[PDB]
Amino acid sequence: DPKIVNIGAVLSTKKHEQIFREAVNQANKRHFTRKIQLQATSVTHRPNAIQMALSVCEDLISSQVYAILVSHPPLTPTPISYTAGFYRIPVIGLTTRMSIYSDKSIHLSFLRTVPPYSHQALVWFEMMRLFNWNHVILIVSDDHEGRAAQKKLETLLEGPKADKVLQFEPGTKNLTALLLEAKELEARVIILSASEDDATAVYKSAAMLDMTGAGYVWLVGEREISGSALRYAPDGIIGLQLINGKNESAHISDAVAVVAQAIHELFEMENITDPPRGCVGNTNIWKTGPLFKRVLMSSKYPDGVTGRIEFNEDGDRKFAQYSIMNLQNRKLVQVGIFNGSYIIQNDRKIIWPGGET
Amino acid sequence: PPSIGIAVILVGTSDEVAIKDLSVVPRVELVAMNETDPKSIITRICDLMSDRKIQGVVFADDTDQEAIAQILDFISAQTLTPILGIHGGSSMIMADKDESSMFFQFGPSIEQQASVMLNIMEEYDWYIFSIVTTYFPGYQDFVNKIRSTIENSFVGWELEEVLLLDMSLDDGDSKIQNQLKKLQSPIILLYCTKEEATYIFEVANSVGLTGYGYTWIVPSLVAGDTDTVPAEFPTGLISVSYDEWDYGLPARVRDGIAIITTAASDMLSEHSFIPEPKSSCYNTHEKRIYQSNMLNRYLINVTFEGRDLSFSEDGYQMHPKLVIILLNKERKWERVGKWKDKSLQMKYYVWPR
Ligand SMILES: *[C@@H]1O[C@H](CO)[C@@H](O[C@@H]2O[C@H](CO)[C@@H](O[C@@H]3O[C@H](CO[C@H]4O[C@H](CO)[C@@H](O)[C@H](O)[C@@H]4O)[C@@H](O)[C@H](O[C@H]4O[C@H](CO)[C@@H](O)[C@H](O)[C@@H]4O)[C@@H]3O)[C@H](O)[C@H]2NC(C)=O)[C@H](O)[C@H]1NC(C)=O
Ligand SMILES: C[C@@H]([C@H](O)c1ccc(O)cc1)N1CCC(Cc2ccccc2)CC1
Ligand SMILES: *[C@@H]1O[C@H](CO)[C@@H](O)[C@H](O)[C@H]1NC(C)=O
Ligand SMILES: *[C@@H]1O[C@H](CO)[C@@H](O)[C@H](O)[C@H]1NC(C)=O
Ligand SMILES: *[C@@H]1O[C@H](CO)[C@@H](O)[C@H](O)[C@H]1NC(C)=O
Ligand code: NA
Numbered sequence: 001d002p003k004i005v006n007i008g009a010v011l012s013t014k015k016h017e018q019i020f021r022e023a024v025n026q027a028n029k030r031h032f033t034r035k036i037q038l039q040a041t042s043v044t045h046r047p048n049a050i051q052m053a054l055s056v057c058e059d060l061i062s063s064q065v066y067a068i069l070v071s072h073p074p075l076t077p078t079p080i081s082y083t084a085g086f087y088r089i090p091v092i093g094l095t096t097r098m099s100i101y102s103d104k105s106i107h108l109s110f111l112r113t114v115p116p117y118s119h120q121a122l123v124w125f126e127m128m129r130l131f132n133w134n135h136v137i138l139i140v141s142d143d144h145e146g147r148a149a150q151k152k153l154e155t156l157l158e159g160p161k162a163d164k165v166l167q168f169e170p171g172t173k174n175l176t177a178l179l180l181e182a183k184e185l186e187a188r189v190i191i192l193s194a195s196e197d198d199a200t201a202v203y204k205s206a207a208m209l210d211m212t213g214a215g216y217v218w219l220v221g222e223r224e225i226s227g228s229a230l231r232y233a234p235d236g237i238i239g240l241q242l243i244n245g246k247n248e249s250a251h252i253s254d255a256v257a258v259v260a261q262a263i264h265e266l267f268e269m270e271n272i273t274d275p276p277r278g279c280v281g282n283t284n285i286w287k288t289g290p291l292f293k294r295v296l297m298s299s300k301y302p303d304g305v306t307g308r309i310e311f312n313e314d315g316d317r318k319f320a321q322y323s324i325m326n327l328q329n330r331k332l333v334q335v336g337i338f339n340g341s342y343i344i345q346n347d348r349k350i351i352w353p354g355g356e357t
Numbered sequence: 358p359p360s361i362g363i364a365v366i367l368v369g370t371s372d373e374v375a376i377k378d379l380s381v382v383p384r385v386e387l388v389a390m391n392e393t394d395p396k397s398i399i400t401r402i403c404d405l406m407s408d409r410k411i412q413g414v415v416f417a418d419d420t421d422q423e424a425i426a427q428i429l430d431f432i433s434a435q436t437l438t439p440i441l442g443i444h445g446g447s448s449m450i451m452a453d454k455d456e457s458s459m460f461f462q463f464g465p466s467i468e469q470q471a472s473v474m475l476n477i478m479e480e481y482d483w484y485i486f487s488i489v490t491t492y493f494p495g496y497q498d499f500v501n502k503i504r505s506t507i508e509n510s511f512v513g514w515e516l517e518e519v520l521l522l523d524m525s526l527d528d529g530d531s532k533i534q535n536q537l538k539k540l541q542s543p544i545i546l547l548y549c550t551k552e553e554a555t556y557i558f559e560v561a562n563s564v565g566l567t568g569y570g571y572t573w574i575v576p577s578l579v580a581g582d583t584d585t586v587p588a589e590f591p592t593g594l595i596s597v598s599y600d601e602w603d604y605g606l607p608a609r610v611r612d613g614i615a616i617i618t619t620a621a622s623d624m625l626s627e628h629s630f631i632p633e634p635k636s637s638c639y640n641t642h643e644k645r646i647y648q649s650n651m652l653n654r655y656l657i658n659v660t661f662e663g664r665d666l667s668f669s670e671d672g673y674q675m676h677p678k679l680v681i682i683l684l685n686k687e688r689k690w691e692r693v694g695k696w697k698d699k700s701l702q703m704k705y706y707v708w709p710r
Contacts, residue, residue: 048642050399050435057396082431083395086424088525104492106453108525279396283422291527 002037005263007256008065009042010056012074012248017042019252020069027260036267038260041065045073053079057279061087064275066263066292069255071095071248081107087282088289089275090296092259094251097222097242099148102314109293111315113251113258113306117193118148120221120240123322123338124191125156127219127238130343134160135187136219139178139202141194142167149193149221163187170198175205183209189217192224199224203232212236214354225325225332233327236353241323243337244306254304262296308340326350360384361412361621362634363614364405368393368445369419375607379622381631383614393420393446398428403638406436410634412621414438415613417606418445421551421581423493426451426462433460435641437648438634439617439656443609448599449578452495454672459653461616463609464599466673467495467548470576471502473597473679474546476701477574477694479512481708487518487542489557491549492525499548499576517542524553533557537564544572547579554579555587567591569710580682583690593710594684595693599677602692616666620655 009020024040041063046052056079060068068084070077071094081101084091085108093101093112101107102116128136138153140146150165163185168178179202182190190211192202199220206212212234223229225239233239244250266272269291276282286292293315301309308319319340326335328351336345350356363383367373368390376387386409390401405411418425425446433440434455442448442462450467454460465473478484488503490496500519507514520536528534537560545566547554554575561567573594580596625631632652635644659666667675681694681703694703 048435048639050403050432050638050641053395053431054399057394079431082427086395086428104523104525105494105496108492279394281392281394281397283392283394283420283424290525291529294526294529297526 002033002035004039005036006039006041006063006065007259008060008063008068009040009252010068010070010080011042011044011252012071013044016071016248016252017044019249020256023253023256027256031260031264036263038263045075049079053083056080056083061089061276062278064277065089066275067092067259069094069252071251077101081110085109087276088285088293090289090293092255094248094255095246097245098145100144102316104314109289111296111311113255113309113317114242114245115317115320116148117145117221117223118152119316119320120322121149121153121156123240123324124153124219125160126338126343128160133189133217135163136160136189136191137182137185137187138162138165138191139182139193140165140167141170141198143170145195146193153191170195173201175201176209179205179209179211183211188215189219192218192220194224196223196227196229199229200232203229203234207234212353216353217357218353225327230332234353235327235330236351237327238350239325239332241325243321243323250305254301254306254309257304258296258299258301258309261301262292262299266292266295358382361618361631362386362409363413363415363617364388364409364411365415365610365614366390366401367417371417371606376610378607379618380625381618381622383618385614393418393422393425395428398425399432399638402432406438406634406638407636410636411438412631412634413617414440415443415610415617416440416447417443417610418447419582420446421585422446423449423550423578425449430454430458430460434458436635436638437632437650439620439652441613441616443613444606445582449581450495450673452498457650458672459650459656461656461668461672463674464577465597465677465679466669466671467498467576468502470597471499472506473696473701474574475503475506477595477681478544480701480703483544483572484513485515485517485542486544486546487520487540488516489520489522489545489547491522491553493549493553496521496548503546522557524549524556533560534564537561537566540566543570544574547573547575549579551579551581551587555589558591559589562589562591580690583682586684586688586690590684592684592686592688596682597696598680598682600680602680604678612661612666615661616656616659619659619661620652623655624652
């Protein structure tokens, strides 16, 4: 008889719950499970945060889960991160790209198989070296996300340089005063970090100040080429799309494989204690929680469905892959891929705002 | 006059009889609670909210569990219910409370405590020091207040080292020990939780940084309950405690009831309404375009019996009376100073061994 080790999950639907149950079954099939054997425990998202936090306790911590997988529903991973964090039970974010989850003070035992939006700076930087854009203008929203992209790009630049950084208040509709400042500058490569609705305001203002045409380059992320941001986006823009970023099925598959490997590596060590059985009356942390975090943080899974899985110093996915998207005749056209470390251009030619610079 | 339901939640042993001593009037209900885990706190407050029309919560506990503050802030923000952390882990400073929070604490800010610490140092001419923090929220606020104070001063301050220790991982690689070994300063300011400090001190002792010639200054949350002294705490440890002595629990509960009532009276007097207390935690998602933080403008500015009970926008007490405490040779916390209206008054001119 082996020792049954539970793995938790907060997933979108019953289909995804079934995918998780199958991934744990496959983990039991491929691993040596005479000593320890995994068991899938899962739920879907609750209507509100208080209800979600209570479900984590009643449905998952009651089953002594060693880790909890979390996707975005069809309402964020925060009440799960907080509840599991109380006990130092690791949480694996499957689809959240908000940089806030990279903050160790707030998200104490949190890792993710998807990178934060701020990590798109890694692609922009490689794009800058490739096309020899040594002088750029960075336009960011004055929110956490905008500042996260700015700090990440600055870290890489400190070769190519950011001539100026311009911040705007999220929700501002008239950005003509901000863009007039950028127009005065010698640099004609503009990098944007804004949400879907804030990018729309930038594009509209930019077009009116005739900055969306020949001579200019617009280098943007995923959020700024989604929903409404695309309706008013200038032709010629270069944006990014995280390959499999929204595939919950692929991320369950990869997160389960990583966790399965880490559990087995953990049980190669001594004095491994079980997590608490439920929340009621338990106010101490899981003594093995921090060791389990360290084992996960340093796990490498090279043959993942979403690529090479490794985590950084904040437990954010490393070696993520992106589609380099280009808006040609109001259509998003894939012009290349960022394979995890390198830019690969395909045979589809880039069309810059107007023609070719 | 109209009646507002106020729940007073008492965790642990307390004298309910001693505790039991405007446009609106309070209908107070003393509630006993045995457990302080997330489920227990969420469940207790949510059950009370459905049984009575609860306008606000007065929370007091006997623990050293700073997580209680965080659990309470979350409840306060999700339900849009004023909650006051008046004692215990509930009053342990919560940095960066939710935007939607109506959570307020009886205690000093990280920035005020950091200020008091430097006032102690200036008294005994302790200008050469180092800082140690974990990732516990407020660490950035602590280091920043110290730095800005020191930057804008014609005093010979010398910050030698700033260490950031990652308590979310195991110490099998002895990273903390290797980090702590870098300390050379005669004075160390430590910002972390009480459970974190027990570990840090155990390690700092192994490296020999806890003896004579090494003075550790710590905030209120590290000392916590002065009757619970972890064995690993070094003798001669200095802390900035909030006056559990003179500002006793029955006074705090009374003051907490006054803040919720005065605020309610003030909002009713100015807008001819007060927010209808939510009968559910389970409906918060659908019923939130009908809920506001509006009562906060009032809760933050309550004066009662000529005592300015006002709070900061960040949810901490504006003018607390702080006590400077020293862990003596008999392993008991001894009173060695007082912090008034921005004035420090110490017991000793010559700091003793
Ligand atoms: C993302 O894209 C990058 C760029 O292509 C890929 O990185 C390369 O991957 C290949 C394949 O593993 C590596 O190729 C191997 O290179 C060895 C020599 O490398 C040196 O020289 C190159 C060129 O200057 C440098 O880039 C590199 O830094 C080294 O200094 C060869 O000896 C290898 O040949 C041997 O092995 C192959 C199989 O791997 C056999 O077929 C051969 O017969 C032979 O025995 C081989 O060619 C290459 O080094 C990597 N380049 C870089 C820059 O790291 C990533 O793999 C790709 N990532 C993903 C996720 O797909
Ligand atoms: C992550 C830590 C805390 O921020 C911290 C502690 C020590 C550090 O070194 C760094 C950070 N918290 C997260 C919230 C937990 C309480 C909780 C539970 C359920 C719902 C809401 C809130 C209590 C633990
Ligand atoms: C999502 O991922 C799974 C791999 O686990 C794959 O079978 C499926 O086809 C992918 N779907 C899309 C839309 O790429
Ligand atoms: C709490 O513990 C005491 C122990 O004497 C008990 O009387 C009380 O009923 C317990 N609380 C609850 C909610 O049952
Ligand atoms: C606080 O309270 C008094 C009550 O008389 C009020 O008049 C005053 O304007 C308030 N202060 C601020 C700054 O809101
Ligand atoms: Na993390």
